[PDB]
Amino acid sequence: QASEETAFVVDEVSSIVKEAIESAIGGNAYQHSKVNQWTTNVLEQTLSQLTKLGRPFKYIVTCVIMQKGLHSASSCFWDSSTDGSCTVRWENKTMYCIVSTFGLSIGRGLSSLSLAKSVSTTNIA
Amino acid sequence: QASEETAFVVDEVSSIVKEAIESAIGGNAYQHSKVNQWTTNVLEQTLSQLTKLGRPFKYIVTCVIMQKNGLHSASSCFWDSSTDGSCTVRWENKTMYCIVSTFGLSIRGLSSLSLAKSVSTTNIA
Amino acid sequence: QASEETAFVVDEVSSIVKEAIESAIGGNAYQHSKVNQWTTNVLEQTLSQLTKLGRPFKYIVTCVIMQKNGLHSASSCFWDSSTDGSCTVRWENKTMYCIVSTFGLSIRRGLSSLSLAKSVSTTNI
Known part of the structure; x- marks a missing residue:
């Protein structure tokens, strides 16, 4: 007896994202020539796995x-x-990777919406 | 003769963002102690002006x-x-960069959704 | 004394296409960050104008x-x-190419009335 998951499950998203970053850049030393390939790789696995969850959300x-x-x-x-949103801050000896995920339910009008400030913040000195 | 705007209109969004950036940090020299309030100020005005457009969108x-x-x-x-849709503005002065990304998502389910890749790319060497 | 235009008229489609490209990107030097909005803009105006013709056609x-x-x-x-039918317009300035391919499909005996057309929109730079 199951039902479609309508909530944004943060720890589930996080697990997917961390796994996408490791796969993409884990164990690598920072390489300028690779960065664009790397970000593309983090994004494609993340979205692939997210969409496969079959949940009624748009994702940024x-x-x-x-x-x-x-x-x-x-x-x-x-x-x-x-x-909801989920933010993952990952590092190794040579680099940082920050991945921000925003899920917007596809489930009135403006008056049902509210401002949420600083849902994702990252300060690296 | 007028109707509610159902589309994300990039130039309009871009103008608002540029205005928020100028107002918040324009003419300032980079100062570490200020970045947090600067960032808060850019976001607040951008979302304030966005909501005033009266369009059926959620914004990130x-x-x-x-x-x-x-x-x-x-x-x-x-x-x-x-x-x-999305809008990215890349602003600079002599001492800092300010990049603001805006994503507008309108208020068949998943079947209607589509993957958009590398929509807000920024590379600064 | 008039009737709905059931034909795909290439010169009319072409005129529209050239005007949309100019409006969208004419007078610009190629800019990487701009291409997405440029592309979206060429297509909007093209389809907006195409549909205004009120001709019984689906367009790609x-x-x-x-x-x-x-x-x-x-x-x-x-x-x-x-x-x-189809219409292809190849536009250039000093720094970029803009190629636009248009296919109009009229909105019988089913598949037996259909035909295989080859190399209808070839581009080689």
């Missing part, structure tokens, strides 16, 4: 890679009852 | 500020290609 | 933008050769 996924200052923050106008 | 808005003292970012989306 | 429209500093493409169709 952002991947940042930086060699070893960065200040980022994200805010939303969304449904706080249905929508 | 990301702001990155970096001292000119390497950044590589890319975004990918699972969304409705006939109604959803 | 494809836009290619490539920087001038090799491309080979060709298209083939299984369609009604009595009623269907």
Whole structure:
């Protein structure tokens, strides 16, 4: 007896994202010539695995890679009852990888939406 | 003779973002102590002005500020290609960069959704 | 004294296409960050104008933008050769190419009335 999952399950998303970063860049030393290939690789596995969850969400996924200052923050106008985000901050000796995931339920109008400030923030000195 | 705008219109979004960036950090020299309030200010005005447009959209808005003292970012989306969209503005002065990404997702299920790859790419050497 | 235009009129489609490309990207130097919005813009105006003709046709429209500093493409169709058609416009400036392929498919005996047309939109740079 099962049902379609309508919630944004953060730990599930996180697991998928961490696994996509390891697969892509884990064990690599930072290489400038590779970075674009790498970000593409993190994004494609992540979205592939996310979509396979078969959950009623649109997704925005952002991947940042930086060699070893960065200040980022994200805010939303969304449904706080249905929508969610997950942020993964990964590093090794030579680089940082930050992947931000935003899920917006495909399940009135503007008055049902609210501002959420700094849902994803990243400060690297 | 007028109707609610059902489409993400990039130039309009771009103008608002540029205005928010100028207002928040324009004419300033990079200062570490200020970046957090700067970033908060860019996001607040952008989302305030976006909501005032009265369009049937949820918004995700990301702001990155970096001292000119390497950044590589890319975004990918699972969304409705006939109604959803994104806008990226890359702003600079003598001492810092400000990159603001905006994603607008309109309020058959998954079948209607489509994968958009590398929609908000920024590479700064 | 008039009647609905049931034919695919190449010169009329071509005029529309050239005007959409100019409006979208004419007078610009190639810019990497701009191509996506450019592409989207060529297609919108093209389809907006096409549909305004009020002709009984489905349209497929494809836009290619490539920087001038090799491309080979060709298209083939299984369609009604009595009623269907295509138009290709190859535009250039000092720094880029913009190729736009348009296919109009008239909205019988089923498949037995359809025909195989080869190399209808070949492009070789």
